[PDB]
Write a protein that binds this DNA or RNA. Structure first.
Length: 176
DNA sequence: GGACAACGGGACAAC
DNA sequence: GTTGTCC
DNA sequence: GTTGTCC
């Protein structure tokens, strides 16, 4: 896929926000825009993008079988590259040129951890996880674990989560 | 003596 | 750093 | 990769 200016990327996301659905036992379920979070370099406001990234919050676990494996896009032609229950990669045709689209899934109780994970950047994410590792924790896109056990942080947002683990909050674009 | 699908360790890849 | 999908 | 199971 080609390179995208930040604003080009914001147009695709805006366009797609009302246009993703999934086929669920024949029926065609539309995905709410309130349940889509733009992530990746887009969310970090980088000048140029290699991917458009969209994290989908799925309401109930039983749907992971159905959302990305049956994902559908109103209007737009595209091909599937790789796809599964938690990561789908699509090459969308958009104005006589093709770009790469990464859809990811998180459940509701994983939401902050997933936005944290997928917002990146990779450098920022490694150095944080290295420090928690040294304190015998593990952090991924689903939770914080100690002794192979979820740590039930009483948090809801990314901002709260970041601070609850012992880090200051930075807007997405100042993460490094 | 070629043409499939099932399996899964490791390549590649998502941030 | 940690996990996902592929053949 | 490898084995299986058809032709």
């Amino acid at each position: 896929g080609g390179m995208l200016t930040l604003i080009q990327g914001k147009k695709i996301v805006n366009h797609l926000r009302s246009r993703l659905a999934f086929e669920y036992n024949g029926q065609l379920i539309k995905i709410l825009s309130k349940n889509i979070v733009a992530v990746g370099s887009l969310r970090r406001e980088e000048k140029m993008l290699n991917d458009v990234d969209m994290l989908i919050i799925v309401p109930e676990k039983k749907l992971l079988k159905h959302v990305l494996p049956n994902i559908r896009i109103k209007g737009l032609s595209f091909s599937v590259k790789v796809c599964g229950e938690r990561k789908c990669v699509l090459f969308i045709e958009w104005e006589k040129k093709t770009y790469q689209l990464d859809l990811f899934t998180a459940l509701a109780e994983e939401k902050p951890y997933a936005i944290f994970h997928f917002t990146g950047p990779v450098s920022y994410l490694i150095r944080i996880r290295a420090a928690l590792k040294k304190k015998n924790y593990k952090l991924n896109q689903y939770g914080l674990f100690k002794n192979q056990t979820l740590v039930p942080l009483k948090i809801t947002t990314e901002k709260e989560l970041i601070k609850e683990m012992g880090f200051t909050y930075r807007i997405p674009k100042k993460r490094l």
